[PDB]
Amino acid sequence: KAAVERSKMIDRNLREDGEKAAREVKLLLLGAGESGKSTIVKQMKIIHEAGYSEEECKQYKAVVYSNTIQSIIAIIRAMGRLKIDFGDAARADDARQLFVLAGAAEEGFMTAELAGVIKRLWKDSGVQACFNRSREYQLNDSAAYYLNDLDRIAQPNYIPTQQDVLRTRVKTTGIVETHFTFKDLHFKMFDVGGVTAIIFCVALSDYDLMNRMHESMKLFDSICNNKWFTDTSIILFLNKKDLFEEKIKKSPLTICYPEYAGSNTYEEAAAYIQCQFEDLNKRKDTKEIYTHFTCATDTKNVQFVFDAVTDVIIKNNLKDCGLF
Numbered sequence: 001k002a003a004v005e006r007s008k009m010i011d012r013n014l015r016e017d018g019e020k021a022a023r024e025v026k027l028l029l030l031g032a033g034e035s036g037k038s039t040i041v042k043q044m045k046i047i048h049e050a051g052y053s054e055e056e057c058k059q060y061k062a063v064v065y066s067n068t069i070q071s072i073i074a075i076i077r078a079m080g081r082l083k084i085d086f087g088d089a090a091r092a093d094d095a096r097q098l099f100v101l102a103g104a105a106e107e108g109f110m111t112a113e114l115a116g117v118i119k120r121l122w123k124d125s126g127v128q129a130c131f132n133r134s135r136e137y138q139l140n141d142s143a144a145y146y147l148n149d150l151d152r153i154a155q156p157n158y159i160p161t162q163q164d165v166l167r168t169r170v171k172t173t174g175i176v177e178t179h180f181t182f183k184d185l186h187f188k189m190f191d192v193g194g195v196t197a198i199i200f201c202v203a204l205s206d207y208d209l210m211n212r213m214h215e216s217m218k219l220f221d222s223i224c225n226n227k228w229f230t231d232t233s234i235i236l237f238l239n240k241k242d243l244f245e246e247k248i249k250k251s252p253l254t255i256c257y258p259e260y261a262g263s264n265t266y267e268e269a270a271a272y273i274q275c276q277f278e279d280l281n282k283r284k285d286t287k288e289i290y291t292h293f294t295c296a297t298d299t300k301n302v303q304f305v306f307d308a309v310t311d312v313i314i315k316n317n318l319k320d321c322g323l324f
């Protein structure tokens with residue numbers, strides 16, 4: 001039906017070489033910090049261009065190291081604040097050596113010695129107990145990913161994989177613009193860090209950490225209901241569904257929504273959140289919100305969701321997309 005929709009247009013006929021003209025789509029990426037905006041951008045390069053070559057991935061190695069060192073130090077420092085002891089008291093020396101090694105370098109690095117110290121600390125029961133209470137302090141979301149894969153990351157000849165790259169946390173400053181072609185549509189994607197359609201990202205896992213989820217709702221409320229976006233397709237990405245899935249097992253939605261009375265399961269809890277956001281639409285009869293549960297780090301899921309998102313654009317906004 002999208003193909004049929006496109007086929008009705010007659011504007012290329014008005015241009016001398018219309019069949020060679022580029023139909024443009026301006027896409028804005030919005031959402032609170034750390035909600036996954038920049039990961040969506042990487043997935044576009046991976047899916048619609050080449051993405052990350054081994055040479056490109058090599059440039060992210062010290063970032064992978066930096067992220068790994070920050071995660072462990074965060075957990076170790078939290079133990080102090082939360083009064084949690086080491087499972088085996090021999091680790092207290094490793095905790096100190098962690099600070100000695102990190103305190104003597106300027107940027108991320110990895111040595112056999114450092115790798116040894118981190119692996120022993122990570123495997124400790126008191127450290128694991130502190131990890132399981134991460135909702136109480138600031139800890140990188142990719143902490144377990146890198147930490148559990150230390151052995152591979154620690155090898156002298158390590159070359160970061162695409163997943164290693166997608167998992168990195170690199171704060172964005174300034175507005176970042178990316179161009180890619182999908183289904184013959186020329187997308188100009190803006191990651192407003194620091195309009196045909198808008199993709200609003202939400203970190204579902206921020207619910208049990210004003211409350212973060214509520215601040216995200218506040219931002220979506222204003223964005224979604226803004227007059228400038230009256231003719232823009234509003235897409236909602238309820239992201240980090242993989243992390244939310246593991247969290248909802250032991251953490252209750254009531255921490256975020258006290259009035260929530262449904263069962264504390266993935267199905268009911270996720271459904272509740274979607275309804276909370278879509279209900280902010282003050283024009284439920286004139287505007288439709290397009291919601292997708294995503295895992296921005298999963299290339300396959302993002303390719304699927306973006307395919308669906310593109311069909312909505314073709315069916316809803318093609319007439320407002322110019323030829324260049």
Ligand SMILES: Nc1nc2c(ncn2[C@@H]2O[C@H](COP(=O)(O)OP(=O)(O)O)[C@@H](O)[C@H]2O)c(=O)[nH]1
Nearest residue numbers: 033034035036037038039166167168240295296
């Ligand atoms: N597990 C998991 N991590 C994610 C997901 N989306 C993003 N991340 C990670 O969360 C962090 C922040 O994402 P990022 O794209 O930097 O957020 P931004 O601040 O919105 O640009 C990065 O370490 C990502 O790798 C997701 O769906 N699942």
Ligand SMILES: [Mg+2]
Nearest residue numbers: 038171172193
């Ligand atoms: Mg970013």
